[PDB]
């Protein structure tokens, strides 16, 4: 995360770090949406234009972290991917439409002080919350500056949902309905954004309905990190729930 802070312990029981076997490195963030299913961005697993094509085999899931670096000896928990499901219309070629992927863990994650799943958006909550100027919370072990350098800790940033249109005159990229942008405006005199490392990251909300937290976005792309005039593109988790709920409810946990 760019221009943000340390996560306080247990600030995101959901936040999961998915990271490579060999070489033993980090590739992305995930959110644990239940004891067995994990929500990530697909481009973490597949971007044919850079050779990203990881496999249940080559990837590792580790739930309950805090420090980037150290293996959190008795909080942190490491899991075995049973399968990954990229979304049929994933569009890696053009602009990342429904740049999502579930992956079902080998065996169920025990919950804890530290491990807890996030709420998945209901049609309702989606209606009321996803609104411009409204803040949302993004998190992770990503570059601290677009270029250099990395946190030893989970960074958290509070960014405002941006107007549907504004997003658009920001990037020549062809923006869609399975995309929501988020940021502080040039002048809004406040900063932060996700970054190269972040992706699959949950972008959460707290319904002041029940005080539950909700995944709304997912980290997706945008140009650079914290470019004046640029805004991070997340994934309309909602917008894509049905496919989301089709599978869990098909071969899910």
């Amino acid at each position: 995360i760019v221009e943000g802070s340390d996560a306080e312990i247990g600030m995101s029981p959901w936040q999961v770090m998915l990271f490579r076997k060999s070489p033993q490195e980090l590739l992305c963030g995930a959110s644990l949406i239940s004891d067995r299913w994990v929500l990530t961005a697909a481009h973490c697993l597949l971007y044919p234009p850079w050779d990203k094509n990881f496999t249940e085999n080559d990837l590792l899931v580790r739930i309950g972290k805090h420090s980037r670096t150290r293996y959190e000896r008795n909080i942190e928990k490491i899991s075995m991917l049973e399968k990954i499901y990229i979304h049929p219309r994933y569009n890696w070629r053009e602009n990342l439409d429904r740049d999502i992927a579930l992956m079902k863990l080998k065996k169920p994650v025990a919950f804890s002080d530290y491990i807890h799943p996030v709420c998945l958006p209901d049609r309702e909550t989606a209606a009321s919350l996803l609104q411009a100027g409204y803040k949302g919370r993004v998190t992770g072990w990503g570059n601290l500056k677009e270029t250099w350098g990395q946190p030893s800790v989970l960074q958290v940033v509070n960014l405002p949902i941006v107007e549907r249109p504004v997003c658009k005159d920001s990037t020549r990229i062809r923006i869609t309905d399975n995309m929501f942008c988020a940021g502080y405006k040039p002048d809004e005199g406040k900063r932060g954004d996700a970054c190269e490392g972040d992706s699959g990251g949950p972008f959460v909300m707290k319904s002041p309905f029940n005080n539950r937290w909700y995944q709304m976005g997912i980290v997706s792309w945008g140009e650079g990190c914290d470019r004046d005039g640029k805004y991070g593109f997340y994934t309309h988790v909602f917008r894509l729930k049905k496919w989301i709920q089709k599978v869990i409810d098909q071969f899910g946990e």
Binding site: G10, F111, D113, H116, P117, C119, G133, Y134, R137
Partner: peptide
């Protein structure tokens, strides 16, 4: 079931140093 309710935050009726930013958004 008991999604997005933290065992050390919501769950012990405490809130984070930034949560508040978030419900002040919704105005």
């Amino acid at each position: 079931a008991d999604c997005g309710l933290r065992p050390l935050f919501e769950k012990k009726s405490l809130e984070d140093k930034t949560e508040r930013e978030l419900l002040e958004s919704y105005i």
